Each structure stands twice: as C-alpha cells, then as structure tokens.
Symmetry: D2
Subunit: 274 residues, 4 copies
C-alpha cells in the first residue's frame, strides 16, 4: 500500500540559486525526525522545471544515498525522453516509485495525454503515481486515469492537487487495495481522509509536523485531527498563500533552520514571517 | 533591423518520433524558396519542450549549418541555466537572435517574470525577442515589456501570439526603430500590418506561401493583401485549428512533401486532408 | 435559528411554459411528506429570472398560502427596485426569510456588491440569507459577507453553491448562533456537515428524500449518512448533471408525478431515465 | 440598410437613482447634435437590467416621442415574457429595430439559446439585431447567429462586444445587404471597418463626437480617421476602462453637461477626472 504522508520536498538552494546539499541533508533529517512515510524530491514544490536534467539526476542521487526512506521521484517533463531517462535512472539507483504529471506548455486533450502515458508506461516497470495538478499543467480526467489503470499494473495511484472536491471524489472512486489516492492540498487532508483518501502529499511538512500529527491522530481521534487541521494547518496554508508560489516555503525553511538559502529566478524572496 | 516574415519552424520527426534532419533540409529549402525572411527553430510550432537540451542544441546547430537566411533561435525553458546555455551556444555558432517567452508550469506574477528576464539579459548580449504566448505560458504585460526594453538595449522587439487585438495594440505602442512588433497569428497579419506591425511569425509558412504573398502585396495593394488573408490564409487556419495543436501542421508538411513523418508523444496523428 | 434541509423549489410549468399551480401543490405536498424544513421558492433551481415580477409575486403568494412550512423567498433581481418590492411583499404576507444573491449581467467588484446589499438591507428588517453562486452571478467574497454581517443583524446566514471547498470553509468561519451556513450542492452535504454546516439547500429534494434521510441519519449513524450520500445522492447528482441545468430536475419531477409539464425557453426538454 | 454609428445611450439618473427625463432629453439633443445615426436605449451601457419592466417601457416611449432618429430598442431579459412584451410594445409605438442578447444568469448551451430566439422571432415581427456580449451573458456562436438568420428574415444583423477579433471576423462572414454587423468596442472601430463592418455601437458617443468624426473621415481619408482612433477614442477608452463599467460613462456625462446625476446601486460614483 502506498499511503500515509508524502513530503513534496523543497530543493534548498544556496545564495547563488544552486542546490544546497547541506541544507538538503538538513531537510532530510527533519523529515525523518517527524516521521513522513515518503520523500518526494523534484515535485512542483521542489520546482523541478527550473532545474536541468543533470541537476535533477544529481539531486535524486543524493536524496536516495542520504535516507533509507522510500522515495517517490518526480520524473516530470514535457519531453518523453527526459521522463524515461529520469525513470531508468531512478530505477537504476533504488528509488521505489516515480511521480508523473501530464506534459505542459502546449494545451492537450485527453487522447494526447493518454498516448504520452501509454508510451512511458510500456517503456517502464517501476511503480508510478499519476499526478493531477491542473493549476500548472493539462488536467487528466478520472476516466483517463481509470483507463491507464486498467492497462498498467505499474500505475499504483493518483495524486490530486486540484482543490476540486468533486473531482477528487471521482479519483477516489478509482481507489482499491492497489491504487492509492492522495490529497495534495494540506488544508483538505482531513476532509479527504473522511472520503477514504490513502493519505496526503503535503508541502508544509517541509517545516511543520502538523500534517503528520493530523494523520496519526485520524484513525482514533477525528475531532483532534480536525482541530489540528482547523487550528495549525489551515492558518499556515493561509499565510503561505499570500505569496507567489513556492518562494514562501523556501523562506520559511531557510528561517526555521537559520540558513542563507537563495532563490533561482523566476523565484525570489517574498518577505514572509513566522 | 527586424522586419518581415518569420517561419516558426516545425521540427520534422521520423516515424520513431526523433528528429528528421533530411526533412529539415526539405523544409529549409522550401522556406528559402518562398522567401520567408527569418528562420525560427524551436518555437511553439517546433514543439521545443518535447526535446532534450541536447536534441535542441543539435537542431539549432543543424539549422545554422544548413542555411544562410538569418536565424531566430527559440531558447525557451523554465530553467534559467538552460536558457543561458542555449543563448551562448546560439551566439557562438552565429545565430543572430534569441527568442524567449516567460517561464511556465508554475503560475508567475510580473515581478517573478521580470526577475527572470533581467537575470538572463544581464548575462547575455545577443539580440533577443520577447515572446508573449499566454495560451501556453504566463503572460508578460506590455508594461513589463516596456520596463525591460528601457533597461536592456539587446531586446530588439516583441512577438505576440495572444490573438487579443487590444493587447497587441498595447505592444505596438512600444514600436520604434530599434523595437519590432510581430503578429503570431497568421489570420491576423493583415489587421496587424495596418496598425504598424513589423510583421508576422506565421506557422502556415511551413507548407504554404500565402503569408509571404500577403506581406509583399501589402505595401501598394491593401485589398489584394486582404483578399489573400480572407480567401487563403484564414481558411487554411480554420482547417488546421480543428485539430490538436500543432499535429495537423506536421501531418500537412508530411503529406505535401511525401514524408513518412512521425509523432513524439504527446503528439499523435490527426487525419487532416490536404 | 436556521438549520436543516432547504428545498430550492422548481417552478412547475404546464405545456405552455406558464406556472402550473396545481402541480406546485403536488410538489408542496411531496415536500411536506419527506419533511424538508424550508421551502425556497424562486431560487436558481426555480429559474426565477425567466419569470416576470408579477408572476413571481403571485408564486410566492401561492406557496405561502398552501403550506405552513417556513419559507425563504428568492427575492433575486439585478434591479434593486424589484428586490425591495419582492421583499416588502413577502414580509407583508408573512414569509419568514428572504434570499438574495448578488446582481448579475454586468461584472461587479466587491464595493458595488457591498453598496447594493447596503442600500437594500437598510430598507428591509426581515431575515435575509445571502446567496453565493459564482457560476451564475458575481461572487461575493467572505470578507464582504462578514462586513455586512456586523452592519445588519437582519442577515441571518449565507448559502454557497460554488462547490469550492476552501471557499466554503471561509464562509463557515463566519458561522455562529445567529448566522447559518448552508451547503448548496447535494453531493457535498456530508462533507459540509462534517465541517460544521447548518445544513443544505438541495434541489434533489424536489423528487427524492435521499438528502433528508442523510441529514437525519447523520446524528447517530455517521457512516450511514455517508453511505446514503455515496450510493443515492451522488449518483443521482451525476445523472442530473449530464444535462443543461436545471431542465433534468423538471423532467424528473414531471415523470415521477406523471405530470405533463413544460419548459419556458431557454429551458427545453432533455431526456432523463428516472 | 442598417449602417453607421449607434449610441448605446446611458440612462441618466437623478440623485435618488431614478430616471432623469430632463437629462435624457439633454442627451438626445446632444446625440442629434453630433449626428449619431441610431439611438440604442436600454443596452448594457444603459444598464437595462437594473430597471423594472415598467421603467424600461416608459423610457423607450420617451425616447420614441422625443427624437426622429431611428431607434433600436434594447429588449433584453432572461424572461421571454418580458421580451415579447417589450418587442410588441416597441413596434406598437414605432421603434424601428429591437436589440436582443442571449438570456443570462444560468449558463446556456447553444440549443437553449436557439429555442429561445426561435420562440421570440416566431412571435414577433419587427426588425431585430442580435447582440453578442459574452462578458455579461452566454455567448451566441456565429453558427447559431447564422441558422437564425436563415430561419427568420426579420433578423437584420448582429452586434458584437466580445473584443475577440477572430470571432468578429466570423460574424462578418455572415454579412450581406440585409445583415448588418456592428463593432461594439469603440477602440476597435477602425480595425472593424477595414474588415467590412457595417458600423459601430459606441458608448463614448454619450459625451464625445470622436467616433462620429472617425466614421465620416474614414470612407474618404483612412489615415485621418485612424489618427482619431489613436489620439481620441483609444485614450478615452483607456481612461474609462480604469473603472467599474459603466459608471465612468455616467460621471462623464454628468460633468460635461453639469448635471447633478446619480447612481442606482450596484452602480456607484467612482471619482473620475478630465
């Protein structure tokens, strides 16, 4: 079962906008500390498309050689060659699963998205999680997920960051013992678990245990989970949302740890407070 | 310095969906034949994000070596490291101009987009054209274009594929001797020349010469130019627009030249008639 | 204190698309039978803007005169004059509450919307529930509702059909003992109750008791309410949503009571399988 | 035979937000005194849906009785009874043409919109121009305009405010000797006339002759006319667009004629200079 809590890791940067591996190690330590169940390097929160194929390869290598935690590697790209390359390399260095969103830039219908996933999943074998994030890329309909699910046992779940609860409940309908469904919006996790979500992919866990507390409080303590959602998580999200995504996550991390972290353009420091 | 007709080149593919350097030749001599003024490899029509940095570097090298008409290289990428490397390569091999659209995937405000163009232009000399294509990426406001223009003399103009006439007229206000303004929708070229456009970047020129005949006819025969727009270009855009962009553009160039051309996912064959 | 199940009544029509007051009675007696708590004539479901001011006054009278259920009168209109008239009229015939959404057609910011509710609330003491349905009219921000809340005690709640769960939780943050928050989408009722909603405004109650069982079951058997939602309401809501709103609701009502009912253009007969 | 410049009259108000028939006469005279070709009362600029059926009737009667200019009556309403009533009324008192945009509030597909126009054009006889304004209501496709045109000889043309040049060109393709096509955006008049537009419906003519000068200078000196579009109409439209539509057109009329005019909420004074 894929389930529990995934941290879409930031990619901590030094002051020249390059990968800070000491800070990455600091982050991994913190995540192990609060007991996330998976590491998710090079997601949206880790801003994978600002990095080169090389840097992403380098960063994936480091994260696996510095934690024994199971890793869902972000293998996103609009180039099928980059996705396959990144997937082979993740498989060849012991990363447990891949995370993939639809290709972006050019707007696509479902047949186009379907064909792309088909090619990738027949060229591959590792556990893949489909990732619907229609704010940054073409949407993948639940039906398209369903059909990809049928043809490929390699597909082990879907992650949804839509914030569309109706869309989410469609994805949930695809849930069974070998298909997880993850909520990618921290403030919607509690509600999602009630609807039977496998868990959440939550970026606040880069610097707060709130989401993990909520989740290990859930099975026993409904109202406590909700309290932690309503009082700690939602306000934190509301504060992060005032800012151009994702630079406030970086600043929060840099401050909580007293690091001189930097920003690769188009990132910039936004001036958030704790 | 910058004026006339630009071909946003298709990037011909073999049946495996990898670059067809022979069709590229067929295509180059076709574009020299009908007399487009500039070659623009790796734009949206060339589906640049589907290729790796390597592939895109090779294709730029090849177009350079195989033609004498001036080149605008598409150096687009949400990764700043990739843009700089693509502009450096382009300069060093004698490509006249770089084309650059705002970063994509993550939604960006105007300060982020500006911080990005600024860090890039601060470390580069070559003639650069800004590219507003808000359908596929974050929009860049005319004012942002203006502010960049004052700060960097190497910005040589701006291209707009928005099809928003009011917006286009705003971009036109920035026009002067050292700042061209190009229309990126073939069907609007006529309306745009009448408002003071330096010209068009028109994908139809990959297998048709309507847009060129239109442009040279324009100077002392407007209603001939309008006729060609109304009778030839606009219908051809109607047939093309029925299909997933840009696939019909490929299948059509393929039919015209009798090429066993292929499709790289998420591209797929559409079934257009010639 | 407002809470429980609100039926946003259809306005039954004869074969000539005029109000069928006999069917309206058939409906009122069905609503009483399944024990909804409030009748809401001339909401969106009741396609109120298709009717004249005179037809609307007349319908509120009929409903008020053929049921002792507490009534929330849809007093919607972009004309502040029609609202005052409709509210004055429904106060004078003993309708308990008014329901008002923001003005439509012309796009409005929050100052215009505020001033419009301001002028109106200053002239009508009666109980009013603000109605937020951004699909059909200008959205009213949570902040704007908060402001009006404190400035007029007459505002007794807010109804939200946006289907935006984050937005709904903002509205719920305004919840208290003299301020209700209703979920307007039937499939979202269970989630909304879990989060503290005062109840639902649910169109399916026009011909289905599903929503009402759900609300009453929720008290002692939580999982049972959820089952009703998933097997009954949600699958019904999917059927109804395959068609242009709200026509399917009308057919479904017509077929169930074997009534020969009609459709005032732009309404039209659809085909639902009941 | 429908051709030239139409004023979408404001409906001037007194300080209490009711119709000022003295100021309305001031307006009519002014419009006669810049030789606009038609008067269009109760279009969007006249904010027709903020008025009662009875006020609207009284206002059309007044404009009929107080000018020999041909009139196009705004007959807009989502209620088909109000449209039949306003149309029958306009023809009875000798208004030449009716103007009708699609019904609003509820989202309508094209079939709903068709059955609605069909019914109305089946029941009324007078000259009728279809009004496409997708910002404030459901869009009506060219194909739908087209079909109606063929079914009903009383459909005399179309007016379009979308600001979508491609879409407007599609509407122009339907043009013929008894099917006029008007450009609704003042700043887009020049571009629209080149493409063959019958004329323009222009709210800046409530208080400025710029559009009327433009249209008469055109036929005989295009470049004199485009200078007007650039130095007079467009900058005026820039200023007016700073504000919540259509309030600034009201303030502007009020200041020019020194009239103590008002605002019916949700209208409000916006504070605009000269």
């Amino acid at each position: 079962m894929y389930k529990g809590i995934v941290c879409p890791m930031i990619t901590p940067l030094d002051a020249h906008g390059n990968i800070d591996y000491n800070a990455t190690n600091i982050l991994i330590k913190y995540l192990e500390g609060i007991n996330v169940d998976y590491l998710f390097p090079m997601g949206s929160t880790g801003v994978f498309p600002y990095f080169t194929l090389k840097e992403r390869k380098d960063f994936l290598k480091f994260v696996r050689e510095n934690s024994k935690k199971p890793i869902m590697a972000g293998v996103g790209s609009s180039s099928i060659n980059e996705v396959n390359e990144l997937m082979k390399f993740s498989m060849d260095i012991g990363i447990e699963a891949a995370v993939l969103m639809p290709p972006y830039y050019i707007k696509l219908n479902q047949e186009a998205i379907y064909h792309y996933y088909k090619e990738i999943l027949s060229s591959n074998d590792m556990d893949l999680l489909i990732y619907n994030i229609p704010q940054f890329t073409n949407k993948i309909d639940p039906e398209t997920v369903k059909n990809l699910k049928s043809e490929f046992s390699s597909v082990k779940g879907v992650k949804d960051s839509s914030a569309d609860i109706r869309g989410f409940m469609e994805m949930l309908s695809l849930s069974d013992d070998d298909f997880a469904v993850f909520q990618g919006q921290d403030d919607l996790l509690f509600t999602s678990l009630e609807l039977g979500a496998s868990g959440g992919v939550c970026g606040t866990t880069n610097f707060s245990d709130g989401i993990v507390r909520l989740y290990h409080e859930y099975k026993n303590n409904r109202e406590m989970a909700l309290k932690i959602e309503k009082n700690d998580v939602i306000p934190l999200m509301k504060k992060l949302g005032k800012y151009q995504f994702p630079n406030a996550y970086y600043e929060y991390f840099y401050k909580k740890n007293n690091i001189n972290g930097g920003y690769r353009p188009p990132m910039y420091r936004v001036g958030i407070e704790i």
